[PDB]
Structure formats: structure tokens, C-alpha cells
């Protein structure tokens, strides 16, 4: 799922043009000269087979040495820039020195990412067919610049960036406890699903893995919400799973009937657990297992396990295409009582 934002719908950080009248401004969704006059004329360019194509959206300027239109794209997450370039069909081309553009460039953070010099060394004339630009934007990008070079004169240099747009993949927001508590579109909470089976480390086998509750309080009849340490601060979760770690204990889901692509959960020991200060780990490790293959293990980040005081960690892992079975495996520290492992906000994504 892709979304595009038109440059003409954004605010430029700066804009310069080659027209001597500085009361005139670079035009949104119109050629420069006609747009400045108030005319309703749309941006148009000569395409293949000399067909004239009209555009609802774009940026209209007059080239200079150079004319520069810049946009701040910091933290915006854009992936591509796409536009058609050429001299607008509305240009004054009555003389051969009019409508002569030496070069058009696209620049990102000081780097030329497109230049018309490659395909058009002599530049653009009134009847030069449009060039389509498609450039990748670096994840770190801060500034994109639309540059046009007039050459000897600016006369008739009606440069248009037709259909000028920035494009990105529609993606989930940065994962936070708040986000998992509010909900994500397309996210299905594990506690809203039936497991195939769910084992636990508690000796009483009449007890069951708990949905949206820690194990012990849940099996005692309480509906207390799952609670974890997030960055040294206690946070309750609306949704999740409550279990007791074992050797291991495992919760198994049959995901064969769906195209599951992602598993998201905070993982740690519930605040309600029995805990005593100890050198030993309370929980040894947690694993996400896809069709018998470990696709996440907590012992990379925590090679000696976790304790009651350990801040809950974010598990965010891709599920391989065509996965039949997902298992969530909890390994007890075996020397203490704090084996009340909870999965805060545990959900699946289907992409």
C-alpha cells in the first residue's frame, strides 16, 4: 500500500525563479507565467508521439542559474520522488532563443540524484518531449531540491515539474505500549484467538494460560491487567497473554489459514510476581518459533537471562511466508519464583 504527497500540497522551505518581477511567485498546479496572471490553464507537456498531456498537479517555475525550489523532508519517511519535466506548452517560443533550458537537476542533501544532461546534453526546447524522473530517497534524507538551469537567457523558460510527488509505503507507527493499547489496523491480538494448546510451569494442571491477565491472579479469579516495567516505569497492558515459564512451556498457534507476516509483543515478568533478590536469572529465555525454527531468541540481547527488575523488551519479528505453526516458548530460570512471564499487547499482522 503506497501513498503519494504532491509537492504542490506541501510548503517549500524556499523557492527562487528566473523572472525579473519578484512580486511573482513560483506556481502551484499551474505554469509560472499563466498561473501568475490568474489564468486557469493547467500544466501541460508534450509526451510520446507528440501527444499533449495535461496535469492537475505540479510546480511551475522560470529557470535561472539555477532556479531552486527546496522542501524539508526530515523524518517524513519518503522513499521515492517522481515527476515529469519539460518546458510547458504555454511557453513563449516565438524566437529560437526563447524556451531554451540547459539543464534540470534533482538534488538531495547536496547530492545530484538526477541530471537531464545524461539523456539531454543540449537540454530542453519548446518541443522536447517530457522526461520522467523516478529517484530513490535515502532514509536519512532532509532536503530535496528542484533545480533548473536557464543558460544564456531566461526568456520562455517555463520549466514545469508535472505531477511532482513524494511516495512512501503506508506502514505502522513506531511501536509503543500506547500504540499496542490503542490498537493497530490489521492487528489481531493473540488473546482474541484460540491456541492449539498451551502448557505452563505451574503444577496445578486445572489452571490455564491466561488471556489479558497474568497467570496466577487470572487463575485466582482476578481480572487485573498485565503490568510491566517499560523504561523503568510501570505500564499496564489492555491485551496480552499470561503464562508460567517451564522447560519450556509453549503456546502454539495454527496460522496455516492466514498470511501472517509479523508478531509484536512486549515481554517480561509481571509486576505481581513473587520476587526475591538473587544472582540467578528469573527467566532464562523467550523464543518465537516458526515451523520448528527459532526466528527470535531473547538470549542475543539478554545472554544471561532476565530478572524481575529487567525492563520488558520489545519483540518485533517477521513471520516467514507460508508459516503453518507459530510457537511461543518460555524458559524458566529454575532457581526462583518470578516465572510469571507475560506478553504485553501480543498481536499478529497480515500483510
The sheet carrying 103-108 orders its strands as 14-15, 67-72, 143-149, 103-108, 111-115
Per CB under 5 A, 88 contacts Ca ion:
no
How far is Cα 174 from Cα 20, in angstroms, rounded to an integer?
47
Q: In the complex with Ca ion, which residue's Cβ is closer, 121 or 292?
A: 121
How far is Cα 59 from Cα 72, in angstroms, rounded to an integer?
16
How far is Cα 329 from Cα 294, in angstroms, rounded to an integer?
10
Restricted to residues 322-341, the positions that interact with Ca ion (CB under 5 A) are: none
Q: In the complex with Ca ion, which residue's Cβ is closer, 99 or 267?
A: 99
Among the listed ranges 11-19, 144-152, 271-279, 317-325, the one in contact with Ca ion (CB under 5 A) is 144-152
Closest CB 63 distance from Ca ion, rounded Å: 6
Per CB under 5 A, 186 contacts Ca ion:
no
Q: Nearest CA to 180 among 342, 322, 338?
A: 342
How far is Cα 340 from Cα 216, in angstroms, rounded to an integer?
8
Closest CB 178 distance from Ca ion, rounded Å: 54
Grid coordinates representing 334 are: 529454575
Closest CB 20 distance from Ca ion, rounded Å: 14
Grid coordinates representing 38 are: 490568474
How far is Cα 23 from Cα 158, in angstroms, rounded to an integer?
17
* Annotated binding-site ranges for Ca(2+): 100, 150, 153, 157
Q: In the complex with Ca ion, which residue's Cβ is closer, 104 or 166?
A: 104
Q: In the complex with Ca ion, which residue's Cβ is closer, 104 or 343?
A: 104
- Which ranges of the chain does DSSP label H, i.e. alpha helix? 32-37, 177-182, 215-219
DSSP 3-state of 313: strand
Q: Nearest CA to 333 among 288, 281, 296?
A: 281
Q: In the complex with Ca ion, which residue's Cβ is closer, 100 or 264?
A: 100
Question: Mask of contacts with Ca ion, 104-143, x by CB under 5 A?
Answer: ----------------------------------------
Q: Nearest CA to 133 among 164, 112, 103, 110?
A: 164
Q: In the complex with Ca ion, which residue's Cβ is closer, 97 or 178?
A: 97
Contact 59, 144 (CB under 8 A): no
Question: What DSSP string describes 260-273?
Answer: EEEEEEEEEE-TTS
Per CB under 5 A, 100 contacts Ca ion:
yes
- By residue count, the chain amounts to 351
Among the listed ranges 41-49, 51-59, 149-157, 333-341, the one in contact with Ca ion (CB under 5 A) is 149-157
Closest CB 137 distance from Ca ion, rounded Å: 29
Question: Mask of contacts with Ca ion, 150-169, x by CB under 5 A?
Answer: xx-x---x------------
Closest CB 133 distance from Ca ion, rounded Å: 20
Closest CB 70 distance from Ca ion, rounded Å: 21
Closest CB 120 distance from Ca ion, rounded Å: 14
| Binding-residue total with Ca ion (CB under 5 A) | 5
Restricted to residues 238-277, the positions that interact with Ca ion (CB under 5 A) are: none
DSSP 3-state of 203: coil
Collect all residues with Cβ–Cβ distance below 8 Å to 310 and sequence separation of at least 6: 229, 268, 269, 282, 302
Closest CB 67 distance from Ca ion, rounded Å: 11
Q: Nearest CA to 170 among 15, 55, 2, 332?
A: 2
Q: In the complex with Ca ion, which residue's Cβ is closer, 151 or 186?
A: 151
* Annotated binding-site ranges: 100, 150, 153, 157
Among the listed ranges 3-11, 99-107, 235-243, 267-275, the one in contact with Ca ion (CB under 5 A) is 99-107
Q: In the complex with Ca ion, which residue's Cβ is closer, 102 or 202?
A: 102
Q: Which residues bind Ca ion (CB under 5 A)?
A: 100, 150-151, 153, 157
Amino acid at each position: 500500500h503506497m501513498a503519494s504527497t504532491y509537492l504542490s500540497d506541501m510548503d517549500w522551505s524556499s523557492a527562487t525563479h528566473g523572472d525579473i518581477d519578484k512580486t511573482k511567485t513560483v506556481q502551484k498546479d499551474a505554469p509560472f507565467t499563466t498561473g501568475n496572471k490568474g489564468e486557469h490553464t493547467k500544466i501541460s507537456l508534450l509526451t510520446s508521439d507528440d501527444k499533449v498531456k495535461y496535469f492537475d498537479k505540479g510546480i511551475g517555475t522560470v529557470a535561472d542559474s539555477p532556479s531552486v525550489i527546496s522542501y524539508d523532508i526530515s523524518g517524513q519517511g519518503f522513499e521515492k520522488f517522481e515527476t515529469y519535466i519539460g518546458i510547458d506548452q504555454s511557453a513563449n517560443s516565438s524566437r529560437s532563443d526563447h524556451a531554451v533550458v540547459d539543464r534540470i537537476e534533482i538534488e538531495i542533501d547536496g547530492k545530484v540524484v538526477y541530471s537531464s544532461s545524461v539523456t539531454n546534453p543540449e537540454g530542453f526546447r519548446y518541443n522536447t518531449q517530457a522526461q520522467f524522473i523516478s529517484v530513490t530517497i535515502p532514509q536519512n534524507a532532509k532536503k530535496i531540491s528542484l533545480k533548473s538551469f536557464a543558460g544564456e537567457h531566461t526568456w520562455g523558460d517555463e520549466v514545469v515539474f508535472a505531477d511532482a510527488k513524494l511516495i512512501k509505503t503506508v506502514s505502522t507507527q513506531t511501536i509503543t505500549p500506547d500504540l499496542l493499547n490503542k490498537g493497530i489496523n490489521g492487528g489481531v491480538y493473540l488473546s482474541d484467538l484460540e491456541w492449539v494448546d498451551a502448557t505452563h510451569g505451574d503444577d496445578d494442571k486445572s489452571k490455564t494460560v491466561q488471556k489479558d491477565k497474568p497467570f496466577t491472579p487470572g487463575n485466582n479469579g482476578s481480572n487485573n491487567k498485565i503490568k510491566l516495567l517499560i523504561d523503568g516505569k510501570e505500564v499496564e497492558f489492555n491485551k496480552g497473554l499470561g503464562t508460567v515459564a517451564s522447560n519450556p512451556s509453549s503456546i502454539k498457534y495454527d496460522v496455516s489459514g492466514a498470511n501472517v507476516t509479523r508478531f509484536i509483543s512486549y515481554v517480561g515478568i509481571d509486576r505481581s510476581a513473587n520476587h526475591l533478590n538473587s544472582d540467578y536469572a528469573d527467566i532464562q529465555k523467550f523464543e518465537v518459533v516458526a515451523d520448528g525454527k527459532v526466528i527470535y531468541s531473547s538470549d542475543s540481547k539478554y545472554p544471561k537471562g532476565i530478572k524481575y527488575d529487567t525492563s520488558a523488551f520489545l519483540v518485533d519479528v517477521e513471520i516467514p511466508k507460508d508459516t503453518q505453526t507459530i510457537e511461543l516458548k518460555s524458559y524458566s530460570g529454575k532457581h526462583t519464583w518470578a516465572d510469571e512471564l507475560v506478553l504485553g499487547g501480543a498481536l499478529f499482522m497480515a500483510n
